[PDB]
Structure 1
Amino acid sequence: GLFGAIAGFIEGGWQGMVDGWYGYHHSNEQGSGYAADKESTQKAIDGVTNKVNSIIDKMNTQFEAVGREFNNLERRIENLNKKMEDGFLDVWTYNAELLVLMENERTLDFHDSNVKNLYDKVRLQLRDNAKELGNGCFEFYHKCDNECMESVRNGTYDYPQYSEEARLKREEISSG
């Protein structure tokens, strides 16, 4: 997409995550599993719901056609009435199709933005304490248990707490 997260550096989606639109997959000594950010999913759901509501009943009064009849010697006004009603119907049909097409583009890019924003949210929290693998995954330089995983997921990762342990591992890897 525009932000290059969905079908981008994250090559594919996950069928194992059913409880949310976006989330994480952790794999540590205690096991592996899926989860959700619980924030981006809520913000997206409300944002998508608001968009759908803002399209449904925003037309206020889309032109309601009314049947009118004209005799044999009123062809001009009859053709005028036919053109008028057909004109409004085409205008609103164009508005309906175009709005759906344009907002569909924004909605998918909106989902793309949220994934990249979530990816940046985790990248900026870890900083150098992990290694960016380039496919949407981060490899920790320190031990991260389940509670450590939850800290990353809910935005409360303590960088200095594991900074010294990560520095020892970064030194070892760079030294060979």
Structure 2
Amino acid sequence: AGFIEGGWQGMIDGWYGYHHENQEGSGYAADKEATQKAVDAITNKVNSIIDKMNSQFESNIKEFNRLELRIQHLSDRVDDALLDIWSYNTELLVLLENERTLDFHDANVKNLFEKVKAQLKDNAIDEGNGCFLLLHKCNNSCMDDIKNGTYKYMDYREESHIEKQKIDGVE
């Protein structure tokens, strides 16, 4: 019903999409190639964090007597040192990547918005809520031209200029 400042429950079929309103009706449509580009990139990130760990064959012993106490002290020191390193680094890693992943999705819906804006130009009014109020008539064929980055500016320029003058007072 007009978000980008809010999520669309009932978007489906994709992460980033559109919602149109015209004479023929309403409806959601996902931008598949932009969604698939992010799905690929995120998949690669998760895989990198997971697949880049290739740990050696290693065996751990703590069952041991007294008389090498010195060795057992160092072995326990090493264990705990290793524990602190991996615990602290992984926590921070996960916190950091989550912050950036969220920023990654934001940048994606924002660039989708900027692409639409650069087509419509002054033929539409930015409602400031990620919606464009079109200053002309836009049938389903027009909507699909926008969703496909094929919308032609001049083909609606005059009709839009007329509609805006109406808005700017005619008396």
**Fold shared by both chains (TM-score > 0.5):** yes
The answer to whether structure 1 residue 66 and structure 2 residue 60 are counterparts is yes
- CA distance in 2 between counterparts of 1:170 and 1:70 reads 86
Q: In structure 2, do the counterparts of structure 1 residues 107 and 64 end up closer, same or farther at CA, with 3 Å as the change threshold?
A: farther
Name the structure 1 match of 2:15: 21
5+ residue gaps, structure 1 = 1-8
Name the structure 1 match of 2:152: 158
Equivalent position to 2:93, from 96, 99, 102: 99
- How far residue 110 of structure 1 moved from its aligned partner, in angstroms, is 0.5
- CA distance in 2 between counterparts of 1:104 and 1:139 reads 34
Amino acid at match of 1:145: N
- CA distance in 2 between counterparts of 1:62 and 1:150 reads 54
- How far residue 93 of structure 1 moved from its aligned partner, in angstroms, is 2.2
Name the structure 1 match of 2:124: 130
- CA distance in 2 between counterparts of 1:63 and 1:98 reads 26
Q: In structure 2, do the counterparts of structure 1 residues 158 and 121 end up closer, same or farther at CA, with 3 Å as the change threshold?
A: same
Q: Secondary structure at the match of 1:14?
A: strand
Name the structure 2 match of 1:50: 44
Q: Would the aligned equivalents of 1:65 and 1:85 in 2 still touch at CA under 8 Å?
A: no
Equivalent position to 2:81, from 74, 87, 91: 87
Q: Would the aligned equivalents of 1:22 and 1:36 in 2 still touch at CA under 8 Å?
A: yes
Relative contact order, CA 8 A, sep 6+: which one is greater? Answer: 1
Alpha-carbon RMSD across the aligned residues, in angstroms, is 1.8
Q: Secondary structure at the match of 1:39?
A: helix
Alignment: residue pair count: 168
Q: Secondary structure at the match of 1:10?
A: coil
- CA distance in 1 between counterparts of 2:144 and 2:66 reads 79
- CA distance in 2 between counterparts of 1:138 and 1:48 reads 29
- CA distance in 1 between counterparts of 2:106 and 2:59 reads 41
Q: Secondary structure at the match of 2:106?
A: helix
Q: In structure 2, do the counterparts of structure 1 residues 164 and 63 end up closer, same or farther at CA, with 3 Å as the change threshold?
A: farther
- How far residue 94 of structure 1 moved from its aligned partner, in angstroms, is 2.2
- How far residue 170 of structure 1 moved from its aligned partner, in angstroms, is 1.6
Amino acid at match of 1:19: D
The answer to whether structure 1 residue 170 and structure 2 residue 164 are counterparts is yes
Q: Secondary structure at the match of 2:9?
A: coil
Name the structure 1 match of 2:102: 108
Name the structure 1 match of 2:31: 37
Amino acid at match of 1:154: N
| Percent identity of paired positions between Structure 1 and Structure 2 | 64
- CA distance in 1 between counterparts of 2:76 and 2:149 reads 61
5+ residue gaps, structure 2 = none
- CA distance in 1 between counterparts of 2:9 and 2:100 reads 24
Name the structure 2 match of 1:11: 5
- CA distance in 2 between counterparts of 1:137 and 1:55 reads 37
Q: Would the aligned equivalents of 1:62 and 1:92 in 2 still touch at CA under 8 Å?
A: no
